């Protein structure tokens, strides 16, 4: 019939997966272990080459319209909006979005603004695809669910990011993740798996220097 008879179990699939990891690569720590990796000259190089082609792909982008006359007008307006963000370009967005290869996760917030003077006066552009760094997110619960572990209601950002030296609704956020199924909100970073090999690789290099 027309009725769900189960749950995605987002809140359980996570809690099993945090136990089955070495403790240096659980959520509140992985943010530090990523940046304490990278300074390996083989780990940096792998990430740099990946971003090289991602930026290239999203540089000469195109919008493909439909057949009707209405779609062609819509395609032109879409191209204008995507190429006229105030202080942002898709290359910068692409290289911010692709950070889920380091942390399994990426958060982008959509902000819309009205046009004052231009070709499409009265319409709404997108002001900025505001990137929210993974490091500035909540270290305790980053992602908040229903009373059950069925769906996601929003994403929490730490209060310490509003200082110089809150929950954002899900409808305003674009989530990207990799390495896991649809039931893993915190995706599996490609550095999970590498970690044990990186620990050994480093130790051996240290022995060579002192040995010589």
């Amino acid at each position: 019939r027309m009725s769900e008879q189960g749950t995605f179990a987002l809140a359980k699939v996570q809690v099993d997966s945090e136990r089955m990891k070495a403790e240096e690569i659980r959520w509140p720590h992985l943010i530090g272990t990523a940046e304490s990796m990278k300074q390996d000259a083989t780990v940096a190089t792998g990430l740099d080459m990946l971003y090289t082609f991602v930026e290239k792909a999203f540089k000469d982008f195109k919008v493909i319209p439909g057949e009707s006359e209405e779609s062609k007008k819509a395609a032109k307006f879409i191209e204008y909006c995507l190429k006229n963000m105030e202080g942002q370009t898709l290359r910068q967005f692409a290289r911010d979005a692709a950070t889920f290869n380091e942390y399994g996760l990426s958060v982008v917030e959509k902000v819309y603004t009205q046009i004052a003077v231009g070709e499409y006066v009265g319409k709404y552009k997108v002001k900025n695809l505001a990137f929210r760094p993974q490091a500035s997110l909540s270290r305790t619960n980053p992602i908040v669910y229903n009373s059950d572990g069925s769906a996601i209601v929003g994403i929490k950002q730490s209060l310490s990011a509003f200082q110089n030296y809150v929950i954002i609704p899900i409808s305003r956020v674009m989530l990207m993740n990799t390495g896991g199924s649809s039931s893993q909100a915190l995706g599996v970073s490609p550095l999970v798996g590498c970690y044990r090999a990186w620990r050994e690789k480093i130790l051996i290099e240290n022995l060579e220097v002192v040995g010589a």
Binding site: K12, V15, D16, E18, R19, E23, R26
Partner: peptide, 8 residues
Amino acid sequence: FFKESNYL
């Protein structure tokens, strides 16, 4: 509720 200890 169910909780798996992060220390295994």
